[PDB]
Write a structure and sequence with these properties.
Chains A, B: This is Major outer membrane protein. Chains A, B: It is found in: Cell outer membrane. Chains A, B: It comes from Bacteroides fragilis (strain ATCC 25285 / DSM 2151 / CCUG 4856 / JCM 11019 / LMG 10263 / NCTC 9343 / Onslow / VPI 2553 / EN-2). The PDB classes it as structural protein. Two copies of one chain form a homodimer. Chain A is an alpha+beta fold. Chain A has a single domain (about 5-105), classed as 2-Layer Sandwich (60s Ribosomal Protein L30, Chain: A), CATH 3.30.1330.60. Chain A contains two helices and four strands. Chain A has helices at about 20-35, 55-75, and strands spanning about 5-10, 40-45, 80-90, 100-105. The termini of chain A are close together. The interface of A and B includes residues 4, 19 and 96 of A.
């Protein structure tokens, strides 16, 4: 009953949620509200191919936090159910490098 | 145990899947493979604010079909589990109008 990991993409150097991602996120929040006991990890990432490690660490943190903030503030999800994990700059998502500018929302087993 | 509806967005007049959407879709396919009995409807849409009704109908069909084709051909999902619904041109997704250029993958209850 654990979600398919949710992908939220971002533009370069930005932690802002686009209209597409707000739409994406509203469906996930409805599922979260339907099963109020489920826990989630909100992994934030950035591409290590540009910017410094510390900038990419902060950016990944802010990306995860913006996803948390929309679920909590806009779609009414208990903040205690969401845990931020700042993954920093990575290449774990391959190329094009913007695929690493992403948040993954995953269920906690 | 039904998925949170999955959003797959498209560029104007196009039914091509971007690198971001292929990444998005790979996580959904893994969930589909984990629970092989689940059925899904693949709703395709276009924005009714541009183009003719018949063009938007075909475009919505091709969008849904491209999502089906990636799940079946690239991520090995039984074609019989996925049903296309061509929604044609709509405004059901609000503005900006590109939010209507989308596929929704939904579980069949």
């Amino acid at each position: 009953a654990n979600i398919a990991p949710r992908t939220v993409f971002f533009t370069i150097g930005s932690s802002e949620l686009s209209p597409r991602e707000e739409m994406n996120l509203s469906y996930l929040a409805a599922k979260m509200k339907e099963f109020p006991d489920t826990q989630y990890t909100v992994y934030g990432y950035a591409d290590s191919a540009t910017g410094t490690p510390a900038f990419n660490k902060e950016l990944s943190q802010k990306r995860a936090q913006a996803v948390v903030n929309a679920l909590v503030k806009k779609y009414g999800v208990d903040s205690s159910r969401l845990k931020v994990d700042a993954g920093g700059g990575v290449d774990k998502f391959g190329k094009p490098i913007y695929l690493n500018r992403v948040v993954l929302v995953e269920s906690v087993k």
